[PDB]
Amino acid sequence: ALNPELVQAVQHVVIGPSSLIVHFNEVIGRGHFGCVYHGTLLDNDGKKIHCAVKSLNRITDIGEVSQFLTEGIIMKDFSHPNVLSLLGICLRSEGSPLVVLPYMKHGDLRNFIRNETHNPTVKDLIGFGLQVAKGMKYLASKKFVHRDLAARNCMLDEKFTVKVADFGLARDMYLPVKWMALESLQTQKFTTKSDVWSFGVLLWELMTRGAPPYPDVNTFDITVYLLQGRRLLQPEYCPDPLYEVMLKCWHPKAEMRPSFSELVSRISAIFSTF
Numbered sequence: 243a244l245n246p247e248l249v250q251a252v253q254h255v256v257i258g259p260s261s262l263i264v265h266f267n268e269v270i271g272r273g274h275f276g277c278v279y280h281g282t283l284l285d286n287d288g289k290k291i292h293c294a295v296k297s298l299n300r301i302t303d304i305g306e307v308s309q310f311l312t313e314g315i316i317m318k319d320f321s322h323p324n325v326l327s328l329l330g331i332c333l334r335s336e337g338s339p340l341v342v343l344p345y346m347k348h349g350d351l352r353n354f355i356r357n358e359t360h361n362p363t364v365k366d367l368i369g370f371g372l373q374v375a376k377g378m379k380y381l382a383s384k385k386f387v388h389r390d391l392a393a394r395n396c397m398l399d400e401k402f403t404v405k406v407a408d409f410g411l412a413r414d415m416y417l418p419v420k421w422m423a424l425e426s427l428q429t430q431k432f433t434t435k436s437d438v439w440s441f442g443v444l445l446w447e448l449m450t451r452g453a454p455p456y457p458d459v460n461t462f463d464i465t466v467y468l469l470q471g472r473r474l475l476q477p478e479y480c481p482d483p484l485y486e487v488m489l490k491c492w493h494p495k496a497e498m499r500p501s502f503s504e505l506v507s508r509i510s511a512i513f514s515t516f
């Protein structure tokens with residue numbers, strides 16, 4: 243019942259069921275990421291690729307299926323070393339459509355840095371910040387606004403490569419007012435400059451090794467608190483030039499904040515001093 247030219251257009255994103263083994267009997271992340279399962283993807287050469295398979299239970303009618311094909315076509319053009327890629331999509335005869343993602347061995351970045359077992363250095367933490375900045379620079383270059391950037395929404399692969407996630411077909415893996423720019427709190431509109439604000443908060447989470455921001459301020463009171471000029475304080479083991487970068491991200495004037503290219507330039511120079 244689907245439109246044939248749309249079916250043709252999505253072909254390059256479609257993973258055939260003979261290319262994929264899904265283990266619907268073993269979930270990833272104890273259900274905390276929703277209906278996400280271990281899977282094995284067979285590439286053109288027959289190489290076995292460990293993947294994360296999400297079942298899209300929200301899709302029922304043919305109209306929802308059609309919009310889903312588009313989201314897949316759009317996100318398949320989005321690939322960068324610091325952005326979570328889309329491996330492909332599955333259109334099943336019986337059962338919900340599937341989203342196929344690369345497996346992220348060390349899960350989300352917030353839980354990784356919060357874990358007592360892991361001891362990342364100040365340099366390693368700065369390195370994660372630089373990787374996120376690189377991923378965001380790529381997104382911003384394609385005029386893509388994330389809207390929910392935070393350490394909880396970045397993943398870490400087996401090589402400790404940070405991937406900006408929670409966007410496109412990788413969203414809803416389960417308002418973020420304490421990560422939101424002052425103008426987003428006032429207007430409910432999001433821009434790349436509001437993403438820069440959220441990046442600033444993410445850098446603070448990195449340097450505090452996952453501490454929650456403004457723990458004594460209600461989500462309702464955040465607007466007034468920011469209007470008074472109060473900002474997150476300098477973390478104990480945060481280099482002064484990197485705290486200046488964080489403060490730049492939270493400038494009340496969106497146009498005054500650094501671009502993601504500026505952030506990459508400035509943070510790489512800080513990383514290189516260590």
Ligand SMILES: Cc1c[nH]c2ncc(-c3c[nH]c4c3CNC4=O)cc12
Nearest residue numbers: 271294343344345346347349350415
């Ligand atoms: C969103 C997403 C796409 N691919 C993923 N692969 C793995 C995980 C993940 C979340 N938590 C944990 C993992 C792996 N081990 C864990 O303890 C998430 C994703």
